[PDB]
Amino acid sequence: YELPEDPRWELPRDRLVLGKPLGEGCFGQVVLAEAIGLDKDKPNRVTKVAVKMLKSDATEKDLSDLISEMEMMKMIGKHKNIINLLGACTQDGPLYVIVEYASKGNLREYLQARRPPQLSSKDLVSCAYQVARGMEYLASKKCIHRDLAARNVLVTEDNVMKIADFGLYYKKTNGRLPVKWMAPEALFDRIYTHQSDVWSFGVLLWEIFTLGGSPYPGVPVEELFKLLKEGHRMDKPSNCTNELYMMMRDCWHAVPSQRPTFKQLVEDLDRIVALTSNQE
Ligand SMILES: *CCC(=O)Nc1cccc(C)c1Nc1ncc(OCc2c(Cl)c(OC)cc(OC)c2Cl)cn1
């Protein structure tokens, strides 16, 4: 196979120093690495980056999957609250797609690790605000995520929330059961919209305020379907205000057209971040 070069995105292969693999626990073959001179002005600067590449046993679908993902990230463009495309190696060897490094891992591990054996209320609302700003931006570029959860948000060395894997039965993965994040129309009718991501955002808010708890406590997966059809929703977590719980319930409206938009959620969360104190 032969790829076209975009000199804007192309990094010479000897500027990339590959490091430790991540393996199962991230989608596809991902390698931590160091890119040398990623800004032309600062060619002696080294930047930490993540690299996606193909396995040894990769099919023709796998190659095209990695090319479509890379191209979709160009279409979408840059936001501080998404994992940004930084560059690619397309020419004198296999396909590398190079993205931003998030030193503190996924949001679920970050929240779990900072449980009392720490985060203020403002940190947690500021986290939800940043995840909302990322999703508002992705929505504006017509990008439906289809698997929004804390595990698919990453955290940088400066505690910036970056949405991950946006350019892509009830059995476990990591050990996660995705169905718990799916809107009813997605679960029952295989329908995915921007409104289905707002449902999943509701479950992500619940994740943030329980410091990375399992959604629907004490509910077996077998009887979760019946409970949703009955109109059951998760109850309010204790580290959470009535305003923020009213926001969750609004995200979990049974009719997708009656849920708030990410634009609407960013406006409300902008206000709540200012009203929330750094001692509360
Ligand atoms: C899998 C999530 C996680 O916990 N990652 C992790 C684990 C231990 C240490 C570190 C530093 C990280 N951070 C990290 N993992 C992956 C990553 O980028 C993955 C990626 C890629 Cl390669 C991609 O290429 C097309 C597109 C993405 O989303 C748009 C993502 Cl998230 C960055 N940092």
Side-chain angles (χ1 to χ4, degrees), residues 1 3-7 9-19 21-23 25-26 28-39 43-44 46-54 56-59 62-77 79-91 93-150 152-168 173 175-189 191-221 223-225 227-228 230-245 247-279:
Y1 74 103
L3 302 181
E5 179 176 336
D6 198 340
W9 294 110
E10 199 69 24
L11 183 75
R13 205 163 289 260
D14 65 19
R15 299 298 78 193
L16 195 62
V17 173
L18 299 183
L22 297 182
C26 290
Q29 176 90 343
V30 176
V31 176
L32 306 188
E34 282 167 296
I36 313 168
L38 208 58
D39 170 26
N44 292 324
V46 182
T47 307
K48 286 165 190 286
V49 296
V51 187
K52 200 174 211 202
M53 67 195 70
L54 296 176
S56 197
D57 60 326
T59 70
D62 299 325
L63 174 65
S64 48
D65 284 358
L66 182 57
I67 293 166
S68 52
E69 174 169 28
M70 177 178 73
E71 285 301 320
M72 204 172 312
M73 282 185 214
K74 294 184 205 181
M75 298 292 308
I76 288 162
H79 201 272
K80 69 167 301 204
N81 298 122
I82 72 178
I83 292 286
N84 295 286
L85 182 63
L86 291 178
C89 303
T90 53
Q91 297 305 282
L95 183 56
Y96 301 156
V97 186
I98 305 165
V99 303
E100 290 186 308
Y101 188 78
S103 64
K104 306 205 187 182
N106 68 85
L107 180 48
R108 191 180 224 169
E109 279 179 76
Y110 173 91
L111 293 166
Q112 269 163 18
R114 282 152 192 77
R115 286 188 167 187
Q118 294 191 43
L119 298 169
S120 61
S121 282
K122 198 203 186 64
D123 298 333
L124 295 176
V125 177
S126 172
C127 178
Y129 170 77
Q130 283 175 75
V131 169
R133 265 223 297 193
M135 289 304 313
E136 181 200 26
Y137 179 77
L138 287 171
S140 75
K141 305 296 180 165
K142 313 306 177 56
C143 178
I144 312 171
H145 192 295
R146 299 198 183 77
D147 188 22
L148 179 58
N152 292 328
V153 175
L154 307 185
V155 180
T156 66
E157 191 61 48
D158 291 316
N159 296 315
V160 185
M161 306 299 141
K162 295 195 166 284
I163 296 158
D165 306 353
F166 59 82
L168 273 57
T173 64
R176 196 165 74 92
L177 289 160
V179 286
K180 286 160 147 200
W181 282 262
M182 301 186 167
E185 72 269 15
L187 214 56
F188 296 126
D189 293 318
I191 289 170
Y192 289 87
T193 65
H194 299 296
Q195 301 142 335
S196 327
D197 282 348
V198 163
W199 175 288
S200 300
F201 178 72
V203 181
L204 187 148
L205 274 168
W206 196 94
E207 282 189 281
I208 292 173
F209 290 114
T210 63
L211 300 177
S214 296
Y216 301 99
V219 172
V221 188
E223 65 195 70
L224 176 54
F225 306 111
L227 283 173
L228 293 176
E230 276 195 311
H232 176 77
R233 304 293 181 262
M234 277 187 277
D235 282 302
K236 192 175 89 68
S238 56
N239 295 346
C240 186
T241 65
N242 289 336
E243 193 162 28
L244 276 159
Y245 186 58
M247 188 174 288
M248 294 182 199
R249 292 299 287 255
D250 291 339
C251 287
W252 298 330
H253 213 296
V255 192
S257 64
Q258 304 303 302
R259 294 164 198 165
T261 63
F262 280 112
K263 185 181 173 200
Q264 284 155 8
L265 285 166
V266 172
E267 280 174 25
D268 289 349
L269 282 169
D270 178 76
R271 187 180 44 77
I272 295 163
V273 159
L275 288 170
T276 304
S277 283
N278 202 25
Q279 54 260 18

